């Protein structure tokens, strides 16, 4: 593979087997006093200032040079320029990738086969802007003459994580907006259980689907419209609660919405990079069109960051690279994102996404097997929850777990005279500082003698309480969890993403992984209607569906 | 560490140098027709059937026998025994571990220091009983007269996890119980957001706390009364919407609550398996004790399987082994739990807890170092929601990843003629096959030529298109997911942690990998107030410090 047969990463490699049991935080930070200011990037958006300190990971100076090295030799500025180019880098499907278009505040032109792409981008948002407002006036009325008090987004995967993520992110900045919902899951529970809690008259349904025949997303669409028309009856009436966000026009007008209410976007927008397009209309339609605009907003500000700035200082690029070190050299299967944020609940199982069906992959550009690891298994649960169910393992286990902390500075809630946000500061801070500091033998002997305990009791107990430390974290603080720094915060993340992808010399941006259990799948339905032993697969498929057709009947 | 210095453990770690690259599904189902039969458990629990398929795992039989003796030579019988004999397990702390004498319907005798612990057990279940009885008909009135509409719960860690994802999972058996609620983050927005939505006339608060001084809980606690208090003045009123679980009759007296109303639990009680206790009293609100009572009667019948079959067709047993095998041979840092139910939506996250607080330790009974690995990083999202989110890892990534997947072979939505669980069946099903069979390149290529790709197409192509396969899972069905199933299933986890826990010789009981936050985050706490610089830590805390001071006034 090409990362294998790097220099600059061989170098970095050799470097790592020789200086490895060298690193030491506690003894780093002794050392260097300005450790802090050597490895944290202070950034002004001019809506809110963003600390990325990295300074308690094990680097050093020379660490830092050999990965920014690494960055060079791999091509990644050159990348990133093909990117925001319009050329085709999602080379597999052959496709471009501009998610930053959807964001280009400039509206500077980006080509895609000789055509500016930004007239067709602005186009939608308007038409976006234009529906939001009338559904947020109360203009936009159900077929009974009321008001939409709840907004009901129909969608998989992409189309499903990120409006939801971000909804909930920003819910304080809702008010006057609908209540919105998100269904997913093919299982009939979740649209089942949301549709009782619901009226037909004054509910709108978005379904979110490119080609508007996905299975799991046009299901629970048709359950919907069965829902509504049983109240409704009229069929005309679906064009008043129904709208699309896709391209299929056809299939559009079959199901019964008004073409004018579909919201397109392209293909070189990922599913898991589509919250900036109309995917993201349910977003627009709870905080209002205004915040959208600052969440994309706040994107475009982190897009130029990561253009304009040199890798040295460049955030994205730095949060890639350390993740490298950590994955190709000290070998972590794992990264968690920890924010601090119960707002964020939501924002590790939105990168879990982003990241793993990115950087997933195992084929490289030139068509060979990778030889070396790619994206991790991403994780995580926000801040003090996280930390009182499995903080234990991070702790004291056995794997090395590089975290990533979050928190905004100012909360959105500060009740009691910031007294909530006051001890969640002192943990958020405490928590890296005890996985890096740790506890010695000696300082939890001295606990120990000073607790009265027995000479004997001390010594069995005495392990048990050390903790070996040099666990590394990032802390990434911002001054408030506006709209516009969730915008800027999602994109940076996507663009760490994209430069560990380049490094690994992998596709980030196509899902060729998915296609198996979908075929898998549709061979399996029709085999479940009945009572007759099914044999036509491996000895498990089949046991498996004839315990399910011989539990059916059982009744429990 | 004992392990490494078991004869068994290493003959299985011999055995896989051997044989690991002889290991694969496809051949291994080829090759036995009743691979199946073989390498499968039903269990007959007399409110439903559970399937464990185990045969879709890189084992033979071999391995099995070879693992069996390992849990025999590591003393796993013995190990249970003394926990259900009420035995000191609980080593480093002195204490015995009881949970199964929470849900101990057959009532027999377990003694903790010569005295019976049931007669204990089943007077606070009583106690609970009775108050569920009166709240949830009305009986018992808020300061104005009006029934109870809503549960407030407040706790963390295990006074909070277990009984969410319970009255999650069992939503549908609510009917006619209270609204509940569930705060647990210090997070100043997770009490504010929830208070601004209810009335404090018909609202009950449930403070989840042994000490009853817990700082996250009791600061959510003493805001949620001052909230109350706002609205009724009187504080004898408190004592009508306020009740505890915890043993601190005094704290709970100068709280304002009524002493009659603490429900206690016990040192022998984990927190992390703590939902079975008075924990569980939200549970019980929501769900009817007679549900919560069924949920209990699950447990027990899980905890006698585990206790009277012998190791080689014992469930706990069987998932405990095959977890040692990919963790210690394969070297698997972690365990995907991956529920196809909406309603388990918080399984996963559940477990993260149960599993990685318990074994997510490195110092063994005798005081030596682990000097090898344990506890694996638990994580997961339920049933296709998952699926259209990291799959594409799972299936084409680098790591390998141990799957469970689960699901109830009945719904407790079959709308539209089970066609929604049909196809969440067909998915169940078509994952684990596809995941363990793959996708060969000549496979991949006839599909490519088949749709009449290019030459030049196909070449570039295929690669991408090819799954390697031989990836492991179990599969885990059950007639139905009632109260009674899913305690069965939660109590046969976590026996499997159990006995992971004995054959790694660490404590699954204790948690002491706690306390270093906790101390340096009191210290934080005062040096957070005032405008002063902190230089008093390592360089990367005073600065984080010193950027929150500064951006506290920041106006955005």
Known sequence: AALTRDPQFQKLQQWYREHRSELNLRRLFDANKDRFNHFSLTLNTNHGHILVDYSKNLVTEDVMRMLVDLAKSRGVEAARERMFNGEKINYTEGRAVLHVALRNRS?????????????????????????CQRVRSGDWKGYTGKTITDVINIGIGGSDLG???????????????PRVWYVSNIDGTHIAKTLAQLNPESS????????????????????????????????????????????????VKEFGIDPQNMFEFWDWVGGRYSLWSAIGLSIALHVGFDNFEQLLSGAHWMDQHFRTTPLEKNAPVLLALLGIWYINCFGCETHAMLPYDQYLHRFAAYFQQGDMESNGKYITKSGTRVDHQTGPI????????????????????????????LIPVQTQHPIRKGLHHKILLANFLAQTEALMRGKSTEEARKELQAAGKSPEDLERLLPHKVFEGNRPTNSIVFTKLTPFMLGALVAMYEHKIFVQGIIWDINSFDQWGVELGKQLAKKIEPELDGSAQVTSHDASTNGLINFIKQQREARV
């Open 107 to 131: 509206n500077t032109p980006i080509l895609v086969d000789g055509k500016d792409v930004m007239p067709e981008v602005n186009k939608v948002l308007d038409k976006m802007k234009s529906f």
């Open 378 to 405: 991403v994780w995580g649960e926000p801040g003090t929850n996280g930390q009182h169910a499995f903080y234990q393992l991070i702790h004291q286990g056995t794997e090395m777990i590089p975290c990533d902390f």
């Open 204 to 251: 709108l349904f978005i379904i979110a689907s490119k080609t508007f025949t996905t299975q799991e997303t046009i299901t629970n669409a048709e359950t919907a419209k069965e829902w509504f028309l049983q109240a409704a009856k009229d069929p005309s009436a679906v064009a008043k609660h129904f709208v699309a966000l896709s391209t299929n026009t056809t299939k």
């Open 163 to 177: 409006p939801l993520m971000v909804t909930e992110a920003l819910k304080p900045y809702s008010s006057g907006g």
